[PDB]
């Protein structure tokens, strides 16, 4: 379509990683490598998750572990992610991440955590 879908949560994702450095939302998959981003998204609809600025990229196991464990706490989201395997492939697939926000997005919808702040 004229607008996308990939695109529309690319440039919603991307919106986030303004608020957070280290973090470039060029990709799902590469620019994932670091693990980094699935945490990062998350503490932006979540502060009491964890001091982002107190992770660094030495520590990714735990990084994705504390992303989805701490999505899972918090909004129980999905289980389509293993960070063992994100940890061996250090390559995500564009359908995972994808799948992954698409369910959590939906999530954040009825919650009305999205719907923040209107423009």
């Not at 990714?60 to 960070?83: G, I, P």
């Given at each position: ?30 620019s ?9 998204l998350i ?34 989201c ?9 940890v ?32």
């Amino acid at each position: 379509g004229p607008l996308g879908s990939k695109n529309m949560l690319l440039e919603w994702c991307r919106a986030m990683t303004r608020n957070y450095e280290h973090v470039d939302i060029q990709n799902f998959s590469s620019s994932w490598s670091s693990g980094m981003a699935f945490c990062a998204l998350i503490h932006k609809f979540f502060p009491e998750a964890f001091d982002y600025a107190e992770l660094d990229p030495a520590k990714r196991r735990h990084n994705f572990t504390l992303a989805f464990s701490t999505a899972e706490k918090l909004a129980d989201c999905a289980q389509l992610l293993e960070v063992d395997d994100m940890v061996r492939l250090a390559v995500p697939d564009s359908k995972c991440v994808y799948t992954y926000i698409q369910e959590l997005y939906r999530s954040l919808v009825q919650k009305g955590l999205v719907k923040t702040k209107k423009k």
